[PDB]
Design a protein around this nucleic acid. Structure first.
Lengths: 168, 124, 243, 59
RNA sequence: GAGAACAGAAAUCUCCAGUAGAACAAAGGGUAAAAGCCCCCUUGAUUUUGAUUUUUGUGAAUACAAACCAUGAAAGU
RNA sequence: GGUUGCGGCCAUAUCUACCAGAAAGCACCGUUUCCCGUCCGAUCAACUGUAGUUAAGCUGGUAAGAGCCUGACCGAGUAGUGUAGUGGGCAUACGCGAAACUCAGGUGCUGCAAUCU
């Protein structure tokens, strides 16, 4: 029985990790900006590595978060690229799931060699009503075991809506 | 420990010094620890305390200021005041004694019975 | 594990629940203490869903004491059934508790506001209750900064705007806009208001209503308390477990 | 005499064996936990070795 | 720890555990809605009057009142 | 007796697993014009308690559970120790006197105000 113990989507984070910093980052900027409607966030490097070719504080990625109907709409238009076929993995233990796409032009947006091509990673966090207890300030607490999301519940919800497969 | 702040300290009261590690401010006096002194003046933030410190073979008088967090009320005079009040009551009853203290006296005569307690003899 | 549990140091119970902040509490309760007894009084405002709380507390090693306490459920008696948690309603509750305490002290004193955990934001209902109390006449220290309509771009304030907020102007203009733009959300969010058919001038007059009423009798007409103690106790013990 | 002393020492030996059994079950599962933790620690410090990571400075 | 295209042990993203094992000028005390990181505003690291401890010489720290000030809604600092 | 708010003492309260919770409240939850802040009304800010839920949180019981606390004619008058002797080659005499461990028992107590079938 599930009157309020459903499994709604909470949010989707779309991320673009670039090998270099500059107008390439600004272009990936622009891509996620146009896809979401809102302004994205530029993420810097934590530490220098010198084999990936970067340094501390270099602005080496850009990402964005989306909540609401927009999130699942973009999710479906992206999963069309993966044609509704994920793996047994790509589902976390705690009940979240994500994938990655090359050739972002495979959802609506055209080639436009003005800018080039980028790939991006979708990650999608799931929950139920009542997550506010671990997110508010006053009254903070944690959620019970029975109400915890899980890989099995998410995979069943996914073999349900979007009507997909597991592929191994 | 908030009960270490709702603690009135009037001039005259006696207090022990026991500074806790949890407050870096005003950690006083390395060997003024477990030592007792009465309070002479009080300000905000503050209490006065005087101690008789001995140097050579005379007791000189060191006055000091301390945060309230380190000081503590002394239970030094509890039995003294209890005995004084009981002495007033006993003096009133006499007016209507050995109110003084006395060490442990030799226990007096008595009788020990054998009803169900027969003595149990034994050996090494 | 065993070692981690043993080396664990638990905080205070009231902190383990997200209920108090001893950092702020000590700065509040701690006195000058050159002056000895001089009990320090603090007005405690709290917001739950469906209800507001305003109290005036002294604290002592007994743990604390409540000389005066009011809530928003009293305001139906004073002329408003609706919107108990809003800005104007908390303002009314603050004026109520202020006139109450001033009556009991017989003067018409100095009380320090407790914010709790709520964030300090321009246009907050805690500052609405502050203005209600200062209305009532208790001298609390404050600044005109955080009242609404404070133009963040400079150091000035418009009194007419927070006057409208006291009278319930934002809810009224939103009522008007949502009404002349739609009726789905209107019928959903204003069912009692819809059955009552109240006006903007209306609702301002009702708040004036209630203001004069609390100025008339702030003496805490208490609840009627049906089904006295033993009834409640036995019926609750029917459903209380026991070892 | 041989009758008496052997039931008394046998009861005491039963107590001894129960004590020993109990202590050894507890320390056995404790040892298993610590050993798995040790192996996990060794496996993670095996892959951390590939990272250059001068521990001193700030990187 | 689990999880996400190129991306691997370390590039960025998300979730769970995590009393401190991190940081605060290397096995130690103290600090977790902080004494830590980020953000907002400032530059009380300011003058005058006396008091205490370390110490007869000062300096150091300490509390204490009046002013000019900063800060926060405030208690207060 | 239940609950809410403010607290005191700060694990007998904490951790883990399961279960129950009529009513009351609390809480999730509904919405985003304004006050406000967010990459993102998720947090924070505001509005109506209306759409609806005890699923969660919270409260209480349960476990030859972990830990935490109390006690022991528990250890034990033991170890250790002050004093004396032309005592032996460490005991005796007058005296003081533990802790760990083990075992047993327990698993929050309370103040102020308000409120509830």
């Amino acid at each position: 029985q599930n009157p309020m113990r459903d499994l709604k989507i909470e949010k989707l984070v779309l991320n673009i990790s670039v090998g270099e910093s500059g107008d390439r980052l600004t272009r990936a900027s622009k891509v996620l900006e146009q896809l979401s409607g809102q302004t994205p966030v530029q993420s810097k490097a934590r530490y220098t590595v010198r084999t990936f070719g970067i340094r501390r504080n270099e602005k080496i990625a850009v990402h964005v978060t989306v909540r609401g109907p927009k999130a699942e709409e973009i999710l479906e238009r992206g999963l069309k690229v993966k044609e509704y076929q994920l793996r047994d993995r790509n589902f976390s233990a705690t009940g979240n799931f994500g994938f990655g796409i090359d050739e972002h032009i495979d959802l609506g947006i055209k080639y436009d060699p003005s800018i080039g091509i980028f790939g991006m990673d979708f990650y999608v966090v799931m929950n139920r009503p009542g997550a506010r207890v671990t997110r508010r300030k006053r009254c903070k607490g944690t959620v019970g075991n029975s109400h915890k999301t899980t890989k099995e519940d998410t995979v069943s919800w996914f073999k349900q809506k979007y009507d997909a497969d597991v592929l191994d | 420990h908030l009960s270490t702040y709702l603690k009135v300290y009037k001039v005259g009261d006696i207090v022990d010094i026991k500074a806790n590690g949890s407050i870096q401010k005003g950690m006083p006096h390395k060997f003024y620890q477990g030592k007792t002194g009465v309070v002479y003046n009080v300000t905000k933030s503050s209490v006065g305390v005087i101690i008789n410190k001995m140097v050579g073979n005379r007791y000189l008088e060191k006055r000091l200021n301390l945060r309230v967090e380190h000081i503590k009320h002394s239970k030094c005079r509890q039995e003294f005041l209890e005995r004084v009040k009981a002495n007033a009551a006993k003096r009133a009853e006499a007016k209507a004694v050995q109110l003084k203290r006395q060490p442990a006296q030799p226990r007096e005569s008595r009788i020990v019975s054998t009803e169900g307690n027969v003595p149990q003899t034994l050996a090494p | 594990s065993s070692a981690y549990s043993s080396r664990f140091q638990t905080p205070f119970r009231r902190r383990r629940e997200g209920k108090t902040d001893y950092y702020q509490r000590k700065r509040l309760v701690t006195q000058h203490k050159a002056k000895y007894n001089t009990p320090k009084y603090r007005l405690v405002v709290r917001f739950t869903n469906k209800d507001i709380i305003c109290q005036i507390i002294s604290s002592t090693i007994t743990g604390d004491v409540v000389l005066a306490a009011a809530y928003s459920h009293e305001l139906p008696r004073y002329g408003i059934t609706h919107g108990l948690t809003n800005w104007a309603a908390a303002y009314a509750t603050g004026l109520l508790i202020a006139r109450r305490t001033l009556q009991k002290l017989g003067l018409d004193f100095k009380v320090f506001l407790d914010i709790g955990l709520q964030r300090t934001t321009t246009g907050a209902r805690v500052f609405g209750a502050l203005k209600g109390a200062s209305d009532g006449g208790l001298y609390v220290p404050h600044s005109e900064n955080r009242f609404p309509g404070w133009d963040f771009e400079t150091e000035e304030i418009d009194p007419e705007l927070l006057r409208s907020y006291i009278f319930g102007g934002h809810v009224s203009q939103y009522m008007e806009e949502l009404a002349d733009d739609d009726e789905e959300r209107f019928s959903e969010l204003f069912k009692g208001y819809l059955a009552d058919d109240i006006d903007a001038d209306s609702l301002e007059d009702i708040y004036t209503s209630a203001h004069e009423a609390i100025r008339a009798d702030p003496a805490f007409k208490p609840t009627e308390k049906k089904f006295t103690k033993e009834q409640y106790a036995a019926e609750s013990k029917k459903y209380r477990q026991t070892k | 005499l041989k009758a008496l002393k052997d039931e008394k020492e046998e009861a005491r030996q039963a107590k001894i064996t129960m004590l020993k059994e109990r202590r050894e079950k507890k320390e056995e599962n404790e040892r298993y936990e610590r050993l798995a933790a040790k192996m996990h620690a060794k496996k993670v410090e095996r892959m951390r070795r590939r990272e250059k990571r001068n521990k001193a400075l700030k990187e």
